[PDB]
Write an enzyme that holds these catalytic residues in place. Structure first.
Site, PDB file in Angstrom:
ATOM      1  N   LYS A  67      -3.451  -2.834   8.477  1.00 17.86           N
ATOM      2  CA  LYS A  67      -3.585  -4.235   8.283  1.00 17.86           C
ATOM      3  C   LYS A  67      -2.410  -4.783   7.486  1.00 17.86           C
ATOM      4  O   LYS A  67      -1.930  -4.072   6.269  1.00 17.86           O
ATOM      5  CB  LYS A  67      -5.016  -4.697   7.916  1.00 17.86           C
ATOM      6  CG  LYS A  67      -6.131  -4.473   8.975  1.00 17.86           C
ATOM      7  CD  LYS A  67      -6.482  -3.379   9.641  1.00 17.86           C
ATOM      8  CE  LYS A  67      -6.842  -2.230   8.715  1.00 17.86           C
ATOM      9  NZ  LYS A  67      -7.078  -0.850   9.089  1.00 17.86           N
ATOM     10  N   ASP A  90       1.172  -1.115   0.050  1.00 20.58           N
ATOM     11  CA  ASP A  90       0.092  -0.089   0.010  1.00 20.58           C
ATOM     12  C   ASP A  90       0.595   1.048  -0.109  1.00 20.58           C
ATOM     13  O   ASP A  90       1.712   1.663   1.029  1.00 20.58           O
ATOM     14  CB  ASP A  90      -0.918   0.025   1.249  1.00 20.58           C
ATOM     15  CG  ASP A  90      -1.750   0.946   1.746  1.00 20.58           C
ATOM     16  OD1 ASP A  90      -1.480   2.196   0.811  1.00 20.58           O
ATOM     17  OD2 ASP A  90      -2.765   0.838   2.350  1.00 20.58           O
ATOM     18  N   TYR A  98       0.709  -0.048  15.607  1.00 21.27           N
ATOM     19  CA  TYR A  98      -0.462  -0.213  14.542  1.00 21.27           C
ATOM     20  C   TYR A  98       0.017   0.945  13.517  1.00 21.27           C
ATOM     21  O   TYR A  98      -0.257   1.919  13.628  1.00 21.27           O
ATOM     22  CB  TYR A  98      -1.768  -0.103  15.079  1.00 21.27           C
ATOM     23  CG  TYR A  98      -2.542   0.063  13.769  1.00 21.27           C
ATOM     24  CD1 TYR A  98      -3.107  -1.092  12.836  1.00 21.27           C
ATOM     25  CD2 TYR A  98      -3.422   1.256  13.809  1.00 21.27           C
ATOM     26  CE1 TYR A  98      -3.928  -1.000  12.053  1.00 21.27           C
ATOM     27  CE2 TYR A  98      -4.539   1.402  12.713  1.00 21.27           C
ATOM     28  CZ  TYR A  98      -4.508   0.312  11.662  1.00 21.27           C
ATOM     29  OH  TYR A  98      -5.635   0.542  10.810  1.00 21.27           O
TER      30      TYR A  98
HETATM   31 MG   LIG Z   1      -2.303  -2.610   4.864  1.00 21.52          MG
HETATM   32 MG   LIG Z   2      -3.953   1.882   3.588  1.00 24.57          MG
HETATM   33 MG   LIG Z   3      -4.926  -2.638   2.651  1.00 25.84          MG
END
Ligand SMILES: [Mg+2]
Ligand SMILES: [Mg+2]
Ligand SMILES: [Mg+2]
Ligand SMILES: [Mg+2]
Ligand SMILES: [Mg+2]
Ligand SMILES: [Mg+2]
Ligand SMILES: [Mg+2]
Ligand SMILES: [Mg+2]
Ligand SMILES: [Mg+2]
Ligand SMILES: [Mg+2]
Ligand SMILES: [Mg+2]
Ligand SMILES: [Mg+2]
Ligand SMILES: [Mg+2]
Ligand SMILES: [Mg+2]
Ligand SMILES: [Mg+2]
Lengths: 389, 389, 389, 389, 389
Positions: free
Chosen positions: A232, A11, A229
């Protein structure tokens, strides 16, 4: 001939938020890989997203863990970041580029990697999967089913060539230990590990009869990389099909139950894994546009593209969740998502405290007046009266 | 840099009836805004409908309540009216142009306005909403949920940056009074007001930590402007997302229950708010065609377009209700619409008497012989015998 | 004039696995048949797949069982194999070409054939069907219904021209025997045979009033040809409609219950026959792309293309499962597929032992220690203690 | 007058397994409490089960934490154990009697206790709840909703007497610390704690206006008592209703979503909490027979008995889940149970590793050969070849 | 102490047809077993039906295969036949009494027998099952699941005491051979056999850790006894639960999917196995009245009665399908029954030809004119013209 199939995914910005990618990012990546192909760095490629994650599927003859391939992906992601994501101020521009310095292997830097090298078979069908809004352990249940559940993979019972079973290479991502377990005999122990989806992840599967590579799952855990975090994980997975490996349909059957997976909003929830169609697939341009993430930044979704390899060339992709049979599965997922969301921030819809330790929540909770319980019992009336007044 | 985002919306004719807009109206509006952009009046724009309402989304650096921006919208609506709606004799040609004389601000003239001005963030995701066949208070429940309901917005609990809550600016449209209420502490009082959706409307939301603008809802009430029912208000709403504001998915989650809203046929009914896909989105032409209104002039629908801002340029729009997860929500809405319509003209499907006072109904009811109740009791037999004979 | 309508079908490779065909295979076949048409070998054609099976629909005046027509199909399949399937290393390249030597008739070589010759009527509507992941007996229930079930075909009762009934030509594929049975009087005996779908297959149907050909079903059983499981048969079927034959809608009604059929994964399961839309139909290019097979290599699907003949030219095809009424039928099929798959490898989801004899399963089962039952009763305790220790 | 209401609950044997209780156990307990009533130890009582747990509801004037009351319950459980459970060799005879020596308080010995003492109001409606196959934190979501969620409890908004909110006494069962948090202002922090249902449990709720006791939940954690899994906790809960406390219907509304809770099979799963009817309620005999646990030892269920107090006498109980409105809720639970069970032993259907540490699973997993991951990468080929050969 | 648990079952007449039993038959059987108990022949008993089959559950200390126990059952069935069934001319009076001469063992005479002998555990929960309108192999899928499917029995994974697996004693009822197969390692081979439900039946299951008896299924095949169809077999099954054996709920979970089973109308169909409630259970009279068979002489149903043993006394029975969770399962079965019945007499709803050989159908089919296929092709036109004229 021997071929390597590599999926390297990252990403590098969302459109808007974490919902999707900007289509110019895919066009840029495809153009960059076309140039690499022209220079002989790779044989073939396909570029696609699921949600806000861009998968670079590449075929080549450089082997696994190759610095040139890994570097080509890194560079592509960095250029998409700089040229597209920064320009349009996309959300999470460069999100998964977690380390600064490429020293030869992209593992540990934030991008996900799944690769296998093999002698290309007389027919070589493969399936590439990509999931968004979840963790690599989201693939634990499907991988178990397609290689070890006779209710999924009829070939375990009825195809004499499959009956010897499979070898699971399971990574403990916390203690950095590898387990090798063989089905059918080790199924119960295997399950005791891989049911803990955040810790014990199936990384590779091999056929027991001959050792052939069967599957490779990407195991990068962004929270362990960053120490907090930051998203994901959003795994990618390669599965080889047929001829003593699960049929294409047995692999797909393993996704026909939209099981609950960890991730979804803020990396902090559980929700059903919806097997989703691509919005579009363009084999000639080598691009597919996958689904968006919407309610609650999901629900989590997986896409499946099938290919046939020839001399390492990729004919495909074919959207393998594109069937009215899978509409039933999507509808189930939609209804389960609605049901579970009515729980709000309570376990098990909200994730356990060990994953919450990576978020800002322990922060917040560290204003707040504990009282020792034994003493509080004596004082309860005065404390309550103090609050009241 | 500082940017202003303005949505200025109006119905200037339907195709047919109140069902939809004519596509040449959108093309005309887009062409007019392209000329404004070329002259430097605005930075960027997007033109779209939901039902029979045309939203002009404009980014610029002129601030809120600016006569040039407001005037550009007025003029665009007047030209669409004269050039397109009158020409094709569309239904309700110029419907929402309720006053004749533009004196600098479009508020109070019939078009809806939602605007915010801010320093553009390092990533600036925004969502533009448009609803048809309803009132501005239709957004009260979603706005409450996304900024104050921990069952919707997990960030209130789990994201340390959000935990201080939000400031709601609530307009009493009847007495022209503004309330400022802070969540979490004032939630119950807030709800006591905004549950009266026709009177107390959330107009703006601000982050409590820093005062940043979070949302702006359009509050024009056509019936109070005209003194009689002339249409539904058909609100527009801007929400900024992420980074201590609700995630894109938390905003969308707030629309995942298709709650009953006031409007629908004749501005006189209640029905579910369906989160609808656009028919088409064309980022290059800067036009999206939204859904039609059909059975019973609805049901009411809301559309959601996401954007990323860069130097005020609008990358987008992205249809954010475009997910099989939202099909479940649409199906629910469809079934609730069928159920409630079997009530016909009875409250609560029909609206209360205070909204009915704006229609022709009190007219009609003023033929008709009341008898004083005490006297009627004595005379009942003779009156009934008179009717019988 | 007299015309022959021939469907000659074969799987010559899948994309990926057994899921679908590669579109260049259809383009190649269409181009080859266009050349045959130009040379006067055939009048007209249409090329289409359902799943991984390519149907060549050809109209011509050469009669049934013609070596030129059969040879043209064989050659087309061989060229697709060599030019396309081998080139892209498709799965099961040349799958259904089971014999080497074409000696004049394609029956017994692996490709399926359904043909009829007739005087072309003043209007000549026909329907071509193709099923994947099943056997020719999958059409037994629909064929019975459309020609003999008054709950399906109202014409049997209410149309005086149909009331004399039909003649079923039933092939016993095991003993190579033909039965001729007439409805209504022989219905019970007919059913006693054709309910055994793997053995007694309706091959042809004729009108009793005049002997006119009504339907032709393809009866090749690949397992009996090869002596082992090498695929599902994947039948094709031609039905003439109207004018004392079942209406188009009566034929379609016969598929409105998605009944369980044999085939699906590994030729070894039972699942619902889903009446599926084509992905695309291009009358000018003479190509339709049918549905994919996904979960568990299915579920089994049937497609329906309607045509009108004129001087043997084919106007069409028209996708006749393309109606929201059939969405209900597809949804039923999807749900039944999910239900039955939870059985795993147990009869009746798994097929009986006579079909399993064609798979590798008897192999496997032949490691494994039977004990004579009478003796085992005496020894049971010692055997169990041996396993325990 | 001042009255104490105490629920003291224990599982002392199941019939069969953990499914239910033997009815003679309830009859014995009722007879024992009738004798206590005759001797003036208690005012009134009611005896009932949900699943395999027996609740002793007792009204008396001895206060909370009273050795006589606690001792009467202990003795009743010991006598049921010895006289009934041992005699019929019931499963888990004496299951929850975890310690040998009663020294005055039953807390910490295995039985669950919920008690409150108050001035009996001019009308004193109370609800007693009992759940089986779950933990005390299963009541966290309902308790939050009924006292702090304006979507549940309309009184928070519309009843001026309730608008000041509630005080939650939250027990951290791991570190033995108590938190006092006040709604509405502390809602987000409250949720950050109580969403971790296995650790932070609402123990008591008080009205903020006056400090009146509102609710008491039982917080014994059997695994922390025993040091290992020996059963689910199976909580009991008392709620006072009306008159500035939630209405009976607001309390019940809090259970109308059958949310996922921890427990179910082997204390190791998550499943929906079904609000269940009693099988029978006999106010004169003072006994109610609650539901059985069946598939997978559940799903988890909660029962609700309403009472009106007068001079401490208990008129009741009334089954408050006995309404066709709640059938919808039960059906939802039934369907969710089926859906989630298809996951088998994978998180989040299987519980997290911190609860699994109390089971035998770590045992088993400690046979099994980890390899250090860095070294394994070098050796992978030789290890796989070793398994293969 | 050591105890034997025996279920001896027979149909000795239906009321009406094959739908149910007459209640005086159960009363007579219970009275006869009460007399046997008084004379010390047995310790305890329970009498119940499912459909038209009467199960005699008896506990005693005479061991398996005991002539006195078997004889007591035979005599009870003969007396019910003579005294009740013949008197009321019930349908199938004495149906399952297939042989005349009792020589010491009831196996091979028509009644079904399931028995186990063991040391009674400190708690001894057992479940007795009875099915109607099906075969003994109907229990193959549930038995596999509860002892070998980790998606059913969590204890295989999470309970260290169960992880060594189970020994299946599989009877080949055709060749009279016994297989002993051990799970997990032999699961695939086990399934290859037991999926052929009419031939390879699980007869007994033993725990691998110690050899303890776990389950016993009745394997009499009436058609093999009689040489023709005379009824469905209608099996009975005993399962011991808990303490290193599957939990009561794991056993029940194995029936939560209402899988298709062979039997139903005329022993010739397949339909879902519905887990049904008893109509009534009377522990004091030792009688339970099970469900009726209705549409199409079914659908097939199974009932489950739980007991706790003490010194061989039977406390129970408890209806273990009596839970709203199982209503969902019954509803599924009801809908599947409707769906599949629309197939009529076609495989796979109708059974395969090897079971049809036991019916009158081959009879009928032997009127009817086969033609040799090669010759028929030459003659087809003349045959069709002969039928036409
Ligand atoms: Mg991710
Ligand atoms: Mg993202
Ligand atoms: Mg993602
Ligand atoms: Mg209008
Ligand atoms: Mg409008
Ligand atoms: Mg309007
Ligand atoms: Mg194929
Ligand atoms: Mg095929
Ligand atoms: Mg085939
Ligand atoms: Mg218990
Ligand atoms: Mg319990
Ligand atoms: Mg318990
Ligand atoms: Mg009978
Ligand atoms: Mg029977
Ligand atoms: Mg029978």
């Amino acid at each position: 001939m021997r071929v390597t199939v590599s999926i390297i995914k990252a990403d590098v910005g969302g459109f808007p938020g974490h919902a999707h990618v900007h289509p110019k990012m895919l066009e840029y990546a495809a153009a960059k890989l076309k140039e690499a192909q022209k220079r002989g760095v790779i044989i073939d490629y396909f570029v696609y997203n699921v949600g806000d994650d861009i998968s670079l599927l590449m075929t080549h003859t450089k082997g696994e863990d190759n610095k040139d391939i890994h570097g080509l992906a890194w560079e592509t992601f960095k250029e998409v970041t700089d040229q597209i994501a920064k320009r349009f101020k996309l959300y999470g521009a460069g999100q998964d580029l977690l380390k600064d310095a490429f020293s030869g292997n992209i593992r540990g830097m934030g991008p996900q990697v799944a690769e296998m090298e093999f002698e290309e078979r007389p027919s070589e069908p493969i399936i590439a999967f990509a999931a968004d809004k979840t963790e690599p352990g989201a693939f634990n249940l499907p991988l178990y089913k397609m290689f070890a559940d006779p209710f999924t993979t009829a070939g375990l019972v009825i195809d004499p060539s499959m009956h010897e079973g499979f070898i699971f290479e399971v990574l403990d991502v916390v203690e950095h230990k590898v387990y090798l377990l063989k089905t059918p005999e080790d199924a119960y122990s295997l399950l005791g590990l891989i049911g803990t989806t955040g810790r014990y992840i199936i990384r590779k599967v091999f056929r027991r009869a001959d050792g052939a590579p069967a599957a490779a799952n990407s195991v990068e855990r962004l929270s362990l990389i960053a120490g907090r975090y930051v998203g994901k994980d959003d795994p990618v997975l390669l599965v080889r099909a047929q001829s003593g490996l699960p049929a294409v349909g047995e692999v797909l059957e393993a996704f026909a139950h939209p099981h609950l997976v960890h991730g979804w909003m803020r990396g902090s929830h559980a929700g059903p894994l919806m097997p989703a169609r691509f919005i579009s697939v363009d084999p000639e341009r080598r691009i597919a546009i996958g689904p968006k993430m919407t309610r609650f930044d999901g629900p989590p979704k997986v896409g499946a593209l099938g290919f046939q390899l020839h001399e390492g060339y990729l004919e495909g992709g074919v959207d393998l969740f594109d069937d009215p049979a899978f509409d039933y599965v999507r509808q189930t997922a939609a209804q389960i998502a609605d049901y579970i969301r009515r729980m709000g921030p309570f376990q098990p819809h909200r994730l356990p405290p060990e994953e919450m330790e990576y978020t800002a929540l322990p922060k917040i909770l560290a204003k707040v007046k504990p009282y020792p319980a034994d003493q509080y019992e004596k004082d309860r009336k005065k404390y309550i009266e103090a609050v009241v007044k």
